[PDB]
Design an enzyme around this catalytic site. Structure first.
Site, PDB file in Angstrom:
ATOM      1  N   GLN A   1     127.462 -54.328 144.364  1.00 44.53           N
ATOM      2  CA  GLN A   1     128.457 -54.952 145.230  1.00 44.53           C
ATOM      3  C   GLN A   1     127.826 -56.000 146.136  1.00 44.53           C
ATOM      4  O   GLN A   1     128.339 -57.117 146.264  1.00 44.53           O
ATOM      5  CB  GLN A   1     129.169 -53.889 146.061  1.00 44.53           C
ATOM      6  CG  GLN A   1     130.340 -54.423 146.851  1.00 44.53           C
ATOM      7  CD  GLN A   1     130.565 -53.659 148.133  1.00 44.53           C
ATOM      8  OE1 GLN A   1     130.048 -54.026 149.187  1.00 44.53           O
ATOM      9  NE2 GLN A   1     131.348 -52.589 148.055  1.00 44.53           N
TER      10      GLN A   1
ATOM     11  N   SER B   1     121.116 -55.481 146.404  1.00 43.37           N
ATOM     12  CA  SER B   1     120.989 -54.729 147.643  1.00 43.37           C
ATOM     13  C   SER B   1     120.037 -53.558 147.434  1.00 43.37           C
ATOM     14  O   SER B   1     120.379 -52.582 146.759  1.00 43.37           O
ATOM     15  CB  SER B   1     122.356 -54.238 148.113  1.00 43.37           C
ATOM     16  OG  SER B   1     122.755 -53.082 147.400  1.00 43.37           O
TER      17      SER B   1
ATOM     18  N   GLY C   1     122.252 -47.409 145.797  1.00 38.43           N
ATOM     19  CA  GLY C   1     121.862 -46.682 144.606  1.00 38.43           C
ATOM     20  C   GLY C   1     121.927 -47.531 143.355  1.00 38.43           C
ATOM     21  O   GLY C   1     120.897 -47.829 142.743  1.00 38.43           O
TER      22      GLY C   1
ATOM     23  N   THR D   1     123.391 -47.920 156.933  1.00 36.50           N
ATOM     24  CA  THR D   1     124.640 -47.841 156.191  1.00 36.50           C
ATOM     25  C   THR D   1     124.876 -46.436 155.655  1.00 36.50           C
ATOM     26  O   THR D   1     125.920 -45.833 155.919  1.00 36.50           O
ATOM     27  CB  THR D   1     124.637 -48.851 155.040  1.00 36.50           C
ATOM     28  OG1 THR D   1     124.495 -50.176 155.566  1.00 36.50           O
ATOM     29  CG2 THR D   1     125.935 -48.760 154.253  1.00 36.50           C
TER      30      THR D   1
ATOM     31  N   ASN E   1     119.642 -57.257 157.583  1.00 40.00           N
ATOM     32  CA  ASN E   1     120.968 -57.719 157.977  1.00 40.00           C
ATOM     33  C   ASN E   1     121.097 -57.919 159.482  1.00 40.00           C
ATOM     34  O   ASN E   1     121.667 -58.921 159.929  1.00 40.00           O
ATOM     35  CB  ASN E   1     122.029 -56.750 157.454  1.00 40.00           C
ATOM     36  CG  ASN E   1     122.089 -55.456 158.239  1.00 40.00           C
ATOM     37  OD1 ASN E   1     121.571 -55.353 159.348  1.00 40.00           O
ATOM     38  ND2 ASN E   1     122.734 -54.452 157.657  1.00 40.00           N
TER      39      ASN E   1
ATOM     40  N   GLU F   1     107.579 -75.446 142.270  1.00 39.10           N
ATOM     41  CA  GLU F   1     106.639 -75.774 143.340  1.00 39.10           C
ATOM     42  C   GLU F   1     106.987 -75.027 144.624  1.00 39.10           C
ATOM     43  O   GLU F   1     107.057 -75.619 145.700  1.00 39.10           O
ATOM     44  CB  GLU F   1     106.623 -77.278 143.572  1.00 39.10           C
ATOM     45  CG  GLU F   1     106.388 -78.094 142.315  1.00 39.10           C
ATOM     46  CD  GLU F   1     106.335 -79.585 142.592  1.00 39.10           C
ATOM     47  OE1 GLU F   1     106.400 -79.973 143.777  1.00 39.10           O
ATOM     48  OE2 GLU F   1     106.228 -80.366 141.623  1.00 39.10           O
TER      49      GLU F   1
END
Ligand SMILES: Nc1nc2c(ncn2[C@@H]2O[C@H](COP(=O)(O)OP(=O)(O)OP(=O)(O)O)[C@@H](O)[C@H]2O)c(=O)[nH]1
Ligand SMILES: Nc1nc2c(ncn2[C@@H]2O[C@H](COP(=O)(O)OP(=O)(O)OP(=O)(O)O)[C@@H](O)[C@H]2O)c(=O)[nH]1
Ligand SMILES: Nc1nc2c(ncn2[C@@H]2O[C@H](COP(=O)(O)OP(=O)(O)O)[C@@H](O)[C@H]2O)c(=O)[nH]1
Ligand SMILES: [Mg+2]
Ligand SMILES: [Mg+2]
Lengths: 49, 434, 47, 430, 49, 431
Positions: B11, B135, B139, B174, B201, B249
């Site tokens: 997600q 992320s 999981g 989270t 974050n 580069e």
């Protein structure tokens, strides 16, 4: 002092599509994707007697 | 005469990727219906595909094992744009059980993902690299990419790569099991990705509250800001430039050794149309804001160490003169000290295209912008805290049992801690002066 | 569905900047200098 | 006769080339559209020096273009004056080495320079009698430094009798462009000295030093820098194209400035460079030419020319001037800095006069000479290089692509040999 | 001798411009092919639908 | 002056031929009534002198249900009325019935019809024989027909689009018997034939054409597409024509090994086709993609001998010559050691027209392949397992002894399969 082969590496214009789009082929027809329809439609149900 | 391939797994990648593609789509003037409107060539080739006439196929392959997010876009406004059959979706969610995503359910999925990637690569003439966004604090998100990275690296050879990961915040979290999943992904990714940036974050949480004046932003607002940075970094490869900088580069001037390849980046300037008009936004002040402690997009204090090498990108109508002045200004500074073994840590890049303002969003339109990608010693702070988070819960083997139930060997966690500790030992060493 | 909507709003500036970057911008002295050989006016036909 | 060809490698040489041909066309009068509209008659007398002839009267400059990346050339091949080059002429690669000296000299260069050598061979040998070569390339740039330097290596191997020229820029310590400058630069100098007959060095810092101090220009731009290179670089060849008092080929200035077979580095300066407002107040006169032309604030090199004692100074005065002399001024000027001329080489300045000035300046001169002041540049660059090498930092790139540390040490060995052998003459006395 | 030499400038410039039309003609003309083909099957989609 | 004749036996062959005939008539420009609304139809159609076009066909069968549909459907006026020889009783999967008792009396009529069709033509170049192996009547007259045709004519070639049963999906119980038996009879009398195992097509249809529930009507349409693609060179002009005579001089390394399995692409339903460029380079890559191989035999398990591929569309040969390069460079598919290079190519001009109301959409490009790969041994061996498990204790044997088939007849058939297996192994063994 330029042999015929390897002489096409020179870039003349964007016509290299027909001879240079395969640079990083991501190998070739090696991976398997057969009977991978399990992800678009639901399996025909299977049960027991 | 270039190209690139975009990939997202989970997600977190999809939402930003869903958020990001408006930026790329809006810039070149391709209407959402995919067909060119109304009626300067080869610029669109940088990210798009030509089938002969009409619409274009974005070089992306969206993946996820949970179909909730994917369905939303597949019935939304951008439905007609992406290729109809490139949006592969799974059937069972990962549920933050990393072991699940790498050996039981993930095996049956990578088969397509390798295929879908292979087809898109074939149509590219000069493949330069990849953009992989996943992320780590999830999981399915970590697992799917980790397997994807393992195959791909052994797939193509010596190709360059870039990963704009998203690590979990130090104190605000989270989930409750994330501390585990953070470490395991690190080992599988440490020895396979050339460059990966640090974008934890929270920093954006503080950044938005500090300058943009927003007291209640949702995840989307974060999605836009990350999108610009990608635009700033990769803008050179498609337009005209006085001094171009390419993707290949990048890790020729950012990674001192093959081991330490984790860097953090910050963005500026950020200012609304509701306050900007009161400052000339001269380049003399803009750059110095870039190095300010509170504007680092990574929740760490750079002042806690020396710098290794910084590659800062501008964009707009900046004349090269100012760069020399600003760089000279930085060196004389007293608060920021450079490591002893790096004489000069600046690679100057300029591109003419100014960032495009998205109406109804936060970012306004200004005639200057500088984006930086720097690898500094301070990144050790994030790693040290992750181990401390990790070590404790293992003390009584809490939650370890489930990972056992998916076929993961008990010692699998044992190898993880050493790599960080082994890497943890590495970080300080490079910090010792000769 | 609410966040993403159409609001679709759709290169002379770039060309102008590119031409601007390549301009000498300091010109030179206004030349009154016209071509003539150094040792041709010295020797002329005599009556 | 005794014509020369131009080969530019890397982006710098390309962008640099885009302006030189712009300047050259104006003086001789080639229409960018390629036809002739010369006003006088002398303009076509020796037009062969830098041009050729084909059907329709168009003239095709013989400027070899070579780069490992596509962005630069296609961009120049479309701007103004970009139609002169024959597209059939010259080629370029598609991958690029990315500031990695090793990559541009071993892997990508090897597969590509074979074809380029063909294009240089056909063009050069076609002329009546080749005089020499002039190559422009920035040392600090990876792809430019690697492939370009190798081409010089092979070139001198097939024409052991011809001359060659190089215009180089070394990253000054103040302003840097690529954190990896030391490695390619240190490697580069080793290959250049052994074969490069004449190596000119121009420092990015000075150019910004020139603009903001004399011109008084408020905001500069890359455009200004290229001209300054363009004005002087064309200057050293005009006397080869027009009749005058004392005409000197590219070889003569070689004969009268290089003392030994190894020291072949000079520093150049152009004048007069005046601000917009001071043009009318400034006086075009003999004393002003020489006085400013030896001014410290004019040399385009980071080194201060007073740090040492000049070995020899060569000048090419341009325009119609009298002949009692600047020479007497040169004679007068020679003594007035008595401590600053190395004694064991009396009569250490040459003079040459040609009779065709550049568009605008009624009187101008170009400076060239060998001075001990350049010792600082390599010393500072030497200090920088030793920093990164002790720790093997970044060393994985060059080591991982077919090169071994042994070579890198040698680059340190020869460079130290060069520098250590450059100051010895400074303390030498008769 | 100059007369014959100058007699070609008109021929080549007109010719190249004459050929240049073929460069623009085919590109604009070719786009008509697919558009008919690309637009052809929308009726099939509606017919399929 | 070049023509072809079709022979069909069995319901599967009947349906496939019907579909290929709708395709063929619609492509060539013949309306259903047979009355046309330069001389290109000669290759397949015969002139009436005044009126319609008489199709070149002769059908056989022993069950009247399917054929009777033909003589009351939309194509009643197409074929000759006496050329649809239809019997009374059905073999019903009893291969013995179709080769010694019921088919022996009917073999006469088919021979006469075949001779009559041959007489009219003056430039016959080959024959096409369709049949389903795993059927009683189907195979039964298949073997005897081939025997009689060979013995009567001689060296004239023969191509057959046979269908063995899928590895797991099957429609009969005795198909392993009649299938294995069919192999012996057909081995020495069929020159070139292509496997089109049923199972693969559903996967081929289901993944790409985007239909949840395909039926045999969907299945048949494709094979007609393969026949049309292979044949169009003979009837229309091409930059490098291919003649049916020039196949088994290039795709049969030895007299024994002559089984080549084919694949088609792009096979893409129109709901999503127009979102990709269908580039000539990319169209050919899908040709060797294992997933689209119409037979359930992985090409990755073995080498390749030689694949004859006939292009069709507007391909500019300059493109094609480049395409082979990438495939040969690929290290996934490796050709046998003794083979120099196993590519022969042909180029046609006309595109494939879309049958009305169909799924497959028209594209400007199309390439079809016919390849004989050593791995094809997978299908022969796998059917060997089931046959061994059956004959181990002779379940269902008792109904073939009385029909007129000697008990020993089954034994030698097994030996032939083992001989073919050994031949495949040896030929694959490199020098
Ligand atoms: N910055 C940012 N992070 C997000 C957002 N949404 C989810 N995340 C991060 O994603 C992590 C959880 O993973 P997901 O985003 O749900 O997707 P995943 O990585 O594939 O794993 P799953 O959670 O099973 O879907 C959380 O720890 C969040 O930190 C977002 O909108 N913005
Ligand atoms: N391709 C294709 N094959 C079919 C179809 N229907 C049946 N078959 C094949 O037919 C075989 C069964 O024999 P049939 O074709 O029905 O009958 P037959 O060939 O006349 O022989 P008999 O069954 O003895 O009458 C099966 O093994 C299938 O392979 C179809 O719709 N398409
Ligand atoms: N005078 C001038 N110098 C330039 C310009 N652009 C770049 N440079 C110099 O070139 C150096 C970089 O060389 P680079 O282009 O990377 O070499 P390359 O890799 O071979 O193309 C920098 O140190 C700059 O000082 C320009 O427009 N004008
Ligand atoms: Mg999830
Ligand atoms: Mg039947």
């Amino acid at each position: 002092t330029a042999d015929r082969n390897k002489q096409a590496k020179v870039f003349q214009n964007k016509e290299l599509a027909k001879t240079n789009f395969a640079g990083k082929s991501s190998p070739g027809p090696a991976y398997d994707v057969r009977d991978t329809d399990y992800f678009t439609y639901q399996k025909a149900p299977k049960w027991k007697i | 005469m270039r190209e690139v391939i975009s990939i997202h797994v989970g997600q977190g990648g999809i939402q930003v990727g869903n958020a990001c593609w408006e930026l790329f789509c809006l810039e070149h003037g391709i209407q959402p219906d995919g067909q060119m409107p109304s009626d300067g060539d080869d610029a669109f080739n940088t990210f798009f595909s030509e089938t002969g006439a009409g619409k274009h196929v974005p070089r992306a392959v969206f993946l996820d094992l949970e179909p909730t997010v994917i369905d939303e876009v597949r019935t939304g406004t951008y439905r007609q744009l992406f290729h109809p059959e490139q949006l592969i979706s799974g059937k069972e969610d990962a549920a933050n059980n990393f072991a699940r995503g790498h050996y039981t359910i993930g095996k049956e999925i990578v088969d397509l993902c390798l295929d879908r990637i292979r087809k898109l690569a074939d149509n590219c003439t000069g493949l330069q690299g990849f953009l992989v966004f996943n992320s780590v604090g999830g999981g399915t998100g970590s697992g799917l990419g980790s397997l994807l990275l393992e195959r791909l690296s052994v797939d193509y050879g010596k190709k360059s790569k870039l990963g704009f990961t998203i690590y979990p915040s130090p104190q605000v979290s989270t989930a409750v099991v994330e501390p585990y999943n953070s470490i395991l992904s690190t080992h599988s990714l440490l020895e396979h990705t050339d460059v990966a940036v640090m974008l934890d974050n929270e920093a954006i949480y503080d950044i938005c509250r500090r300058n943009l004046d927003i007291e209640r932003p949702t995840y989307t607002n974060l999605n836009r800001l990350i999108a610009q940075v990608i635009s700033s970094l990769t803008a050179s490869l498609r337009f005209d430039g006085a001094l171009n900088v390419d993707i290949t580069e990048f890790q020729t001037n950012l990674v001192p050794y093959p081991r330490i390849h984790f860097m953090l980046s910050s963005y500026a300037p950020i200012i609304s149309a509701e306050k900007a008009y009161h400052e000339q936004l001269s380049v003399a002040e803009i750059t110095n804001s870039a190095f300010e402690p509170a504007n680092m997009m990574a929740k760490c204090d750079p002042r806690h160490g020396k710098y290794m090498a910084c590659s800062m990108m501008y964009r707009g109508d900046v004349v090269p003169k100012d760069v020399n002045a600003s760089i000279a200004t930085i060196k004389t500074k007293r608060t920021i000290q450079f490591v002893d073994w790096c004489p000069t840590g600046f690679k100057v890049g300029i591109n003419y295209q100014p960032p495009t303002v998205v109406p109804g969003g936060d970012l306004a339109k200004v005639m200057r912008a500088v984006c930086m990608i720097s690898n500094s010693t301070a990144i050790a702070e994030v790693f040290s805290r992750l181990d401390h988070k990790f070590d404790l819960m293992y003390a009584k083997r809490a939650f370890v049992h489930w990972y056992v139930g998916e076929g993961m060997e008990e010692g699998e966690f044992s190898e993880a801690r050493e790599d960080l500790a082994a890497l943890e030992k590495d970080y300080e060493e490079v910090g010792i002066e000769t | 569905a609410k966040t993403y909507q159409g609001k679709q709003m759709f290169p002379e500036k770039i060309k102008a900047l590119s031409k601007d970057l390549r301009a000498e911008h300091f010109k030179l002295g206004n030349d009154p200098q016209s071509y003539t050989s150094e040792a041709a006016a010295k020797f002329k036909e005599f009556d | 006769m005794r014509e020369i060809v131009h080969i530019q490698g890397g982006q710098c040489g390309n962008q640099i080339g885009a302006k030189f041909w712009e300047v050259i066309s104006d003086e001789h009068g080639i229409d960018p559209t390629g036809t002739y509209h010369g006003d006088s008659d002398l303009q076509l007398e020796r037009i062969n020096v830098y041009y050729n002839e084909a059907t329709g009267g168009r003239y095709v400059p013989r400027a070899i273009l070579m780069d490992l990346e596509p962005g630069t050339m296609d961009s120049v091949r479309a701007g103004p004056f970009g139609q002169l080059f024959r597209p059939d002429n010259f080629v370029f690669g598609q991958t690029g080495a990315g500031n990695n000296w090793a990559k541009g000299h071993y892997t990508e260069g090897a597969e590509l320079i074979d074809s380029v050598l063909d294009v240089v061979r056909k063009e050069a040998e076609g002329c009546d009698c080749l005089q020499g070569f002039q190559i422009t390339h920035s040392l600090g740039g990876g792809t430019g430094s690697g492939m370009g330097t190798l081409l010089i290596s092979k070139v001198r191997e097939e024409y052991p009798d011809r001359i060659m020229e190089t215009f180089s820029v070394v990253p000054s310590p103040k302003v840097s462009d690529t954190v990896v400058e030391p490695y390619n630069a240190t490697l580069s100098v080793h290959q250049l000295v052994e074969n490069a007959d004449e190596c000119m060095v121009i420092d990015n810092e000075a150019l910004y030093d020139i603009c903001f101090r004399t011109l008084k220009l408020t905001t500069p731009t890359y455009g200004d820098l290229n001209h300054l290179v363009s004005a002087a670089m064309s200057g050293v060849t005009c006397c080869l194209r027009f009749p005058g008092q004392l005409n000197s080929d590219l070889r003569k200035l070689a004969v009268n400035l290089i003392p030994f077979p190894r020291l072949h580095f000079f520093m150049i300066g152009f004048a007069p460079l005046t601000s917009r407002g001071s043009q009318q107040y400034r006086a075009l006169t003999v004393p002003e030419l020489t006085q400013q032309m030896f001014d410290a604030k004019n040399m385009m090199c980071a080194a201060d020319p007073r740090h040492g004692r000049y070995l020899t100074a060569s000048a090419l005065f341009r325009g119609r001037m009298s002949t009692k002399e600047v020479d007497e001024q040169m004679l007068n000027v020679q003594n007035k800095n008595s401590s600053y001329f190395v004694e064991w080489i009396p009569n250490n300045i040459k003079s040459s006069i040609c009779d065709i000035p550049p568009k605008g300046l009624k009187m101008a001169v170009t400076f060239v000479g060998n001075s001990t002041a350049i010792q600082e540049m390599f010393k500072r660059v030497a200090e920088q290089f030793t920093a990164m090498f002790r720790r093997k930092a970044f060393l994985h790139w060059y080591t991982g692509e077919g090169m071994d540390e042994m070579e890198f040490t040698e680059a340190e060995s020869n460079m130290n040999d060069l520098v250590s052998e450059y100051q010895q003459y400074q303390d030498a006395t008769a | 001798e100059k007369e014959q030499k100058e007699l070609e400038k008109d021929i080549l410039t007109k010719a190249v411009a004459a050929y240049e039309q073929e460069v623009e003609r085919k590109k604009k003309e070719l786009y008509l092919t697919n558009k008919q083909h690309q637009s052809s099957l929308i009726g099939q989609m509606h017919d399929k639908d």
